[PDB]
Structure formats: C-alpha cells, structure tokens
Design an enzyme around this catalytic site. Structure first.
Site, PDB file in Angstrom:
ATOM      1  N   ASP A  15      19.711 -21.585  21.174  1.00  0.00           N
ATOM      2  CA  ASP A  15      19.250 -22.326  20.006  1.00  0.00           C
ATOM      3  C   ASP A  15      20.235 -22.336  18.824  1.00  0.00           C
ATOM      4  O   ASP A  15      19.857 -22.716  17.700  1.00  0.00           O
ATOM      5  CB  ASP A  15      17.805 -21.918  19.585  1.00  0.00           C
ATOM      6  CG  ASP A  15      17.713 -20.451  19.152  1.00  0.00           C
ATOM      7  OD1 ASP A  15      18.803 -19.863  18.805  1.00  0.00           O
ATOM      8  OD2 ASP A  15      16.596 -19.893  19.101  1.00  0.00           O
ATOM      9  N   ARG A  29      21.297 -23.986  13.581  1.00  0.00           N
ATOM     10  CA  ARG A  29      20.112 -23.401  14.293  1.00  0.00           C
ATOM     11  C   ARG A  29      19.126 -24.533  14.535  1.00  0.00           C
ATOM     12  O   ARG A  29      18.799 -25.308  13.615  1.00  0.00           O
ATOM     13  CB  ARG A  29      19.527 -22.296  13.397  1.00  0.00           C
ATOM     14  CG  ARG A  29      18.187 -21.681  13.812  1.00  0.00           C
ATOM     15  CD  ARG A  29      18.340 -20.992  15.176  1.00  0.00           C
ATOM     16  NE  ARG A  29      17.167 -20.129  15.444  1.00  0.00           N
ATOM     17  CZ  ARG A  29      16.022 -20.570  15.963  1.00  0.00           C
ATOM     18  NH1 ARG A  29      15.882 -21.848  16.335  1.00  0.00           N
ATOM     19  NH2 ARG A  29      15.070 -19.677  16.288  1.00  0.00           N
TER      20      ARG A  29
HETATM   21  C1  LIG Z   1      14.419 -21.986  12.888  1.00  0.00           C
HETATM   22  C2  LIG Z   1      14.460 -21.323  11.505  1.00  0.00           C
HETATM   23  C3  LIG Z   1      14.809 -19.980  11.394  1.00  0.00           C
HETATM   24  N1  LIG Z   1      14.814 -19.418  10.135  1.00  0.00           N
HETATM   25  C4  LIG Z   1      15.089 -17.961   9.925  1.00  0.00           C
HETATM   26  C5  LIG Z   1      13.718 -17.224  10.138  1.00  0.00           C
HETATM   27  C6  LIG Z   1      14.080 -15.935  10.832  1.00  0.00           C
HETATM   28  O1  LIG Z   1      14.405 -14.904   9.827  1.00  0.00           O
HETATM   29  P1  LIG Z   1      14.666 -13.396  10.339  1.00  0.00           P
HETATM   30  O2  LIG Z   1      16.169 -13.343  10.630  1.00  0.00           O
HETATM   31  O3  LIG Z   1      14.418 -12.690   9.030  1.00  0.00           O
HETATM   32  O4  LIG Z   1      13.876 -13.010  11.511  1.00  0.00           O
HETATM   33  C7  LIG Z   1      15.358 -16.320  11.615  1.00  0.00           C
HETATM   34  C8  LIG Z   1      15.069 -16.598  13.058  1.00  0.00           C
HETATM   35  O5  LIG Z   1      16.299 -17.069  13.729  1.00  0.00           O
HETATM   36  P2  LIG Z   1      16.750 -16.561  15.101  1.00  0.00           P
HETATM   37  O6  LIG Z   1      15.621 -16.888  16.050  1.00  0.00           O
HETATM   38  O7  LIG Z   1      18.016 -17.370  15.317  1.00  0.00           O
HETATM   39  O8  LIG Z   1      16.921 -15.054  14.994  1.00  0.00           O
HETATM   40  O9  LIG Z   1      15.844 -17.487  10.962  1.00  0.00           O
HETATM   41  C9  LIG Z   1      14.525 -20.181   9.014  1.00  0.00           C
HETATM   42  O10 LIG Z   1      14.557 -19.664   7.852  1.00  0.00           O
HETATM   43  N2  LIG Z   1      14.220 -21.497   9.095  1.00  0.00           N
HETATM   44  C10 LIG Z   1      14.139 -22.082  10.317  1.00  0.00           C
HETATM   45  O11 LIG Z   1      13.829 -23.285  10.349  1.00  0.00           O
HETATM   46 CA   LIG Z   2      16.311 -17.004  19.110  1.00  0.00          CA
END
Ligand SMILES: Cc1cn([C@H]2C[C@H](OP(=O)(O)O)[C@@H](COP(=O)(O)O)O2)c(=O)[nH]c1=O
Ligand SMILES: [Ca+2]
Length: 129
Positions: A15, A29
């Site tokens: 992703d 992302r």
């Molecule tokens: C997909 C997405 C992830 N994120 C942030 C939330 C999660 O924070 P945390 O890092 O604090 O868990 C992290 C998840 O991404 P990953 O799944 O790439 O780890 O990215 C957003 O802020 N907005 C989004 O649209």
């Molecule tokens: Ca992931």
C-alpha cells in the site's frame, strides 16, 4: 475528482509506492486500504501484486480526494491508477487489502471499495480465506 500524472520511482510494499509527482519524489500511501506489512501473512503477496501492477503500467496517475493530501509522515494520500485501473480497488478485490482508514472528507471511493471487499469475501480470497 481528477487524475494527474505521475511516474513510478520504486515499488515499496502493498500500500505504499514511491512516485514522482509534479517533478518531485514522494512516497504515496493508498487511500482507504490496508495491506498486511511485508512480515505478516499475505504481506509478500500484496507487495508483489502492487509491484507488478505499477511496474507493468504504461501510465501511472494519482488522484487526490477532497481532504488532506499528505499524512503526518509526509506521505501523499491518493488513489493510484495503473493504465486506468485503480490499484486501491484491485488490492481489495483480490483479498490482499482490507478497506480501512476511512476518514470523513477523504472517502470519495469508499462504497466502490466496500463493494469490491464484499466480493473478495464471498470468493473467500486470500485474507478472507
Ligand atoms: C491511509 C491513511 C493512513 N494514515 C496514518 C494513520 C496511521 O497512523 P499510525 O502510524 O499512528 O498508526 C498510519 C497507518 O499507515 P500504515 O498502514 O502505512 O502504517 O497512517 C492517515 O493519517 N491517513 C490515511 O488516509
Ligand atoms: Ca499497511
């Protein structure tokens, strides 16, 4: 929403993808999905799926939603298309990602992706097996 050009720099995992957007390298992302990390079950398969899809593409595009365009890590938040096919949706349809991280105001394609997830679940594919 509208598609804009980008070019592949490097596949990262299921992703996240490194793309050049307006001439600048960025990690994107994928909106509204969550693939397993490479070290989890289906992680390697998700990574390979995305990699194949973006490396084979003649044309990459990114589409931002209505809300925030970068996350707190400086990653671009978009739907990414390969030769017109959405990578986010394709991962979900194959049971290689869950619909996830659905934040208000960046959720234009939510119902499209949930319909794909329902069909991957019925087919008992990958994560749903
Ligand atoms: C997909 C997405 C992830 N994120 C942030 C939330 C999660 O924070 P945390 O890092 O604090 O868990 C992290 C998840 O991404 P990953 O799944 O790439 O780890 O990215 C957003 O802020 N907005 C989004 O649209
Ligand atoms: Ca992931």
């Amino acid at each position: 929403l509208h598609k804009e050009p980008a070019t592949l720099i490097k596949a990262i995992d299921g992703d996240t993808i490194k793309l050049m957007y307006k001439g600048q390298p960025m990690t994107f992302r994928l909106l509204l999905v969550d693939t397993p990390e490479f070290n989890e079950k289906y992680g390697p398969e998700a990574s390979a799926f995305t990699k194949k899809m973006v490396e084979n593409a003649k044309k990459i595009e990114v589409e931002f939603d209505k809300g925030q365009r970068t996350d707190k890590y400086g990653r671009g938040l978009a739907y990414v298309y390969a030769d017109g096919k959405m990578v986010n949706e394709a991962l979900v349809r194959q049971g290689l990602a869950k619909v996830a991280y659905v934040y208000k105001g960046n959720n234009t394609h939510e119902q499209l992706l949930r319909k794909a997830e329902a069909q991957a679940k019925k087919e008992k594919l990958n994560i749903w097996s």
